[PDB]
A paper describes a structure:
A key component in the generation of cellular metabolic energy is the F1Fo ATP synthase, a biological rotary motor that converts the proton motive force (pmf) to adenosine tri-phosphate (ATP) in both oxidative phosphorylation and photophosphorylation. The enzyme is comprised of two rotary motors, termed F1 and Fo, that are coupled together by two stalks: a central “rotor” stalk and a peripheral “stator” stalk. The Fo motor spans the membrane and converts the potential energy from the pmf into mechanical rotation of the central rotor that, in turn, drives conformational changes in the catalytic F1 motor subunits to generate ATP from ADP and inorganic phosphate (Pi). Here we have used cryo-Electron Microscopy (cryo-EM) on detergent-solubilized cysteine free [name] ATP synthase13 to probe its structure and understand its rotational dynamics and coupling.
Focused classification of rotational State 1 highlighted five sub-classes, here termed Sub-states 1A, 1B, 1C, 1D, and 1E; with resolutions of 3.1, 3.3, 3.1, 3.2, and 3.3 Å, respectively. However, comparing Sub-state 1A with 1B-E shows a ~36° rotation of subunits α3β3γεc10 (corresponding to the F1 motor plus the c-ring) relative to the Fo stator. Importantly, this rotation describes a ~36° movement of the c-ring in the Fo motor without any corresponding rotation within the F1 motor: the α3β3γεc10 subunits are rotating as a rigid body relative to the Fo stator, with the movement mediated mainly by changes in the peripheral stalk. Sub-state 1A was in one rotational sub-state (here termed Sub-state 1’), whereas Sub-states 1B-E were rotated by a single c subunit relative to Sub-state 1’ (here termed Sub-state 1”). Thus, across our maps of [name] ATP synthase, the rotor (consisting of the subunits γεc10) was observed in four discrete rotational positions relative to the Fo stator: one in each of States 2 and 3, and two in State 1. In State 1 the un-stretched spring corresponds to an Fo rotation angle in-between two of its 10 preferred rotational sub-states. These two correspond to the observed Sub-states 1 and 1”, which have similar quantities of stretch (close to 1/20 of a revolutions), and therefore also energy stored in the spring. The maps presented here were generated from material imaged in the presence of 10 mM MgADP and all showed the enzyme in the “autoinhibited” state, with the C-terminal domain of the ε subunit (εCTD) in the “up” inhibited position interacting with the F1 catalytic subunits.
Author numbering:
A (entry chain a): 4 to 269
B (entry chain X), C (entry chain Y): 1 to 52
D (entry chain H): 3 to 69
E (entry chain L), F (entry chain J), G (entry chain M), I (entry chain Q), J (entry chain S), K (entry chain I), ...: 3 to 79
H (entry chain R): 3 to 78
The structure:
Amino acid sequence: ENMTPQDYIGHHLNNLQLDLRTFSLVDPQNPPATFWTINIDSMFFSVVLGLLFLVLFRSVAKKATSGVPGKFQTAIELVIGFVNGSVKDMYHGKSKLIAPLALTIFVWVFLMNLMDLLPIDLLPYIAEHVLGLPALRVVPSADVNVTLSMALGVFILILFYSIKMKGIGGFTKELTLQPFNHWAFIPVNLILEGVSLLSKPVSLGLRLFGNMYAGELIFILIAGLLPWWSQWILNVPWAIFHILIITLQAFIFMVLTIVYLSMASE
Amino acid sequence: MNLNATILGQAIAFVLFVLFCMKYVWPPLMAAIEKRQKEIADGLASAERAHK
Amino acid sequence: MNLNATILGQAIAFVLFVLFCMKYVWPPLMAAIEKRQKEIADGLASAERAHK
Amino acid sequence: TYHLDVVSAEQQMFSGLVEKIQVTGSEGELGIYPGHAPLLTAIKPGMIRIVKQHGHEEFIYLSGGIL
Amino acid sequence: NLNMDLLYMAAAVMMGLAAIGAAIGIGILGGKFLEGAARQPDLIPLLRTQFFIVMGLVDAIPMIAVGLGLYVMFAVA
Amino acid sequence: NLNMDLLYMAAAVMMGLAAIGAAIGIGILGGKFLEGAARQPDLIPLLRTQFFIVMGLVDAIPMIAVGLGLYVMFAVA
Amino acid sequence: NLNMDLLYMAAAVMMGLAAIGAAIGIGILGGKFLEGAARQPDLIPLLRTQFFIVMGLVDAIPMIAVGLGLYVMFAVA
Amino acid sequence: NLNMDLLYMAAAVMMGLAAIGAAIGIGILGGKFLEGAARQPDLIPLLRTQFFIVMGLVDAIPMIAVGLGLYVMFAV
Amino acid sequence: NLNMDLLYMAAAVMMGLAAIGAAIGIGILGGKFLEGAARQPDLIPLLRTQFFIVMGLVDAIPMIAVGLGLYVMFAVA
Amino acid sequence: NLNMDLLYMAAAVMMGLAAIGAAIGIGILGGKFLEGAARQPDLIPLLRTQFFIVMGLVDAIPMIAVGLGLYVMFAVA
Amino acid sequence: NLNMDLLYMAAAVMMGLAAIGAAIGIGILGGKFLEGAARQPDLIPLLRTQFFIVMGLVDAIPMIAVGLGLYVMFAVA
Amino acid sequence: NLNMDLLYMAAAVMMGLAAIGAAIGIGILGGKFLEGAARQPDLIPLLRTQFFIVMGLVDAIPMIAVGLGLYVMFAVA
Amino acid sequence: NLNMDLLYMAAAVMMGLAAIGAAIGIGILGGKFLEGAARQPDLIPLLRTQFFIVMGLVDAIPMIAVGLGLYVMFAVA
Amino acid sequence: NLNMDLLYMAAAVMMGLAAIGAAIGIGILGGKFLEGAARQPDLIPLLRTQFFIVMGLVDAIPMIAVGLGLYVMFAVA
């Protein structure tokens, strides 16, 4: 098994896709050209959590009593408290959509990041040596496509709220007048506001992507370079630090989503 | 990196999980907590109404 | 090089990673849940005894 | 114009409406025009200039105090 | 690999600049948070909430900078 | 050809500089928001409102530069 | 050849500098605006009016430079 | 040949440094202007009178630089 | 020959900027830590906890810069 | 041709750096002039006629670098 | 040959940057420490105690930038 | 003829830095002087004295650099 | 040339960056020392002693480059 | 000889950085000196003493670079 450090660290970049056109698993050595090649490792594994989310919340929501709650119910109410105490501070419009939307984003993004705290090679090890197939990486958040998909979705919601809540007549007045509120500036104002709009989803997604990709790649490094008995001294502190980041990314994403949506709807 | 149609695929699962939680989970727990709050608020309120 | 050594280093790292959590992370997280449980026992009982 | 008071533990010393005043604040000379933002400072012993409305400049001697 | 050696300078410029920017931005913001806390310790949790609320904006570009610099360093190069 | 060797550097700079700019700008702008909050809490909703109003105008040129940098690094290169 | 790429290097330097300038300038300006508001929120609209009046002056030169970036990248090309 | 592009680098240097200078300077100056205005809100007209006067001094050298950069790019 | 120079030049710039960013950010922050300490000294250890919790997020990116820097010196020579 | 072009770049570094010096230097100095102004609207003439003096010191060296930069670009060419 | 003799530029960059990072960083940090003393002269040695703690974090990166520069000085070149 | 044209780049990288240093130093110092005067109008002359006496030390090493720059650009050129 | 003389260049870089570092790192702390003195006219000696302590703590790491540039010029070149 | 221009450049660099550093540091320190003087005018000679004292450290490093620059510009070049 001639894995060199420079090579082992290169293999880790590779997803296990399947050609949409030809139902072919795309082999790592040659990457086919097309837009029709699903990343299977970050998609099924992403909805793994999409399901383990509902199935871990639905299994209380029906059961609860407003009396003294159990410990699991105590944690669930603590998380609903965090979320709702956040949302109530900044969105005054009572539109139902924003309230459970933040819950999904927070919990789901936290779960996506959480996978990365397990050692890197182990899931690929099992998934290749038993199931044979040529590739595996296990952090949905470290695939740009998921992040920019969520960004595009919230971007749709932004524009919808802008329409519904102040219409095209307000939307156009804003995009034309701001910031200077006079005709002589407008042809420049028109570019600025669209740029700002596009930046919101762009930044929202790319912040998370970069954070998690860079956090993963450190573990990718040390597990192949240092003398294997020593790797703990620089794998451990990094994870110790990393937990704070995976949580903060979910928090930031949730709160900025709330903020921008409120900013459009109010 | 080279973008992929998965950016289109993932959005569907996202919106589906939103559609589900939105109705199957949230109002349920909203009631499950609001009821617990109201039952205490009303207890102390009625007790003040008694003392007055 | 050798593959099997990498799993060994990863295990040595992972156990030392978890050990600190279960003595410095989870105890506070569960302590907050105990705080909430105590609170809600307080908030309900202290209104039932006002019903009394 | 704004409404100025100069008072002491014992007796009042001025009351009425003013345009500006100039005061040798503890940290530096200072001048108050209407609408001045809230402020609080000690002042050094010395004169202060009142210009009563219609512009009737006046001088008062203060042995210290707080503004 | 003259072409390749410019890439490992490009990643260096990108992420060095991102490092300075993010580090100093967070330093300033956290400094103001610290003095605010020292004024009002019993506000500390709310001010931490707000510190994390805004800090997410200081990283908006510098992470994108890592997002592309490291990508080039390991997918283009 | 030689084009591959310069563009991945030009974009690198074009975006690292915007990183520095936006990072320092937002750090400074948020510092005063935190000090004001710690000074007079419960005005936090109003401070946050007009903070976000202003902050939107700080991102303009940095984000334009980021966009054009990417438009070069891939669509041109 | 170089008569293409060095144009992009010039565009990168020009827009990077313009971005740092506009961002940090408006960050300082907005910071002082914020604390001014915090000390008395009832003036806010007047301060905002003067804030815009000045933030216009800030941008005059950066917005020249940014546009010249495009004149380079799409007319000299 | 080198005569064409390098000149525009010589332009962008001046152009960008002028943007830096003007932006940061007007920033500082307007920051103090806004704090002074929030102090004495009713004297805004006089403060603005003096503000524009002092400001006119700041853009001088940056405006020289940009005037020359325009030549370097367009005329040559 | 020329190939193996730019790796060390890249590490040089990358880690010098990492050092600048880290030192300046955390000096700024520690200045406010010491301000608060000298203003509410019985409060020190709490504010030191908060200082470390800020410092973590400050040092998040510079240390990745250090890692990616030494990568170029010892993982790719 | 060879002996001409770099002179354009020599003038640039001078007239560029000279701008930043004079703009910020007059920027800071102008600020404190306004800081004093609001404390004492009555001394606004006396300070004005004080601003102009030291304002002459700051802009001394920059105006050297402007003339000499012009010398190279038009008198040396 | 060019490489080893040029690598000495790398250390000059790498450690020259760290020099100012550490120098300005603690320059700020010490500046606050002195004022805590000038306000609480009956509190200095406590403030000095904590000063030493944080003062380590400031240069912690400059340490390796310097040491790695010395590795280039002698070991690499 | 390179050793001729390059000396103007040398003169630039002397004069521009000298100019920036002088302008920044004198702007800072004159700002402190100006606000001092704005507070203590009677002490204008007494402070003016000290301003000149102190500025005399700032102007010392910019004048060295500008002298050497004039030497290079004319006395040898 | 490139074997012998570029060693002078890198040492000039070392002893220029460290020249920035010493000047600013000391100026900041010295200004805080002076303002503390003006606040506490009785404590000049105490404060100056603490200042010299932290002064040496500052200048330690620049002085590395201070010696190193000379060694390069006169022992390596 | 095609590498005397490199020695002109190295000297110009080291001296320009020394000029920036020394000017700015002395400016800061003198600014605080004038503030203190404006507060306690009957202390100006006592603080002016210390201003002369600490000021030396603000230039003790830069003057090294200045002397080396003169040396190379006339003794070597």
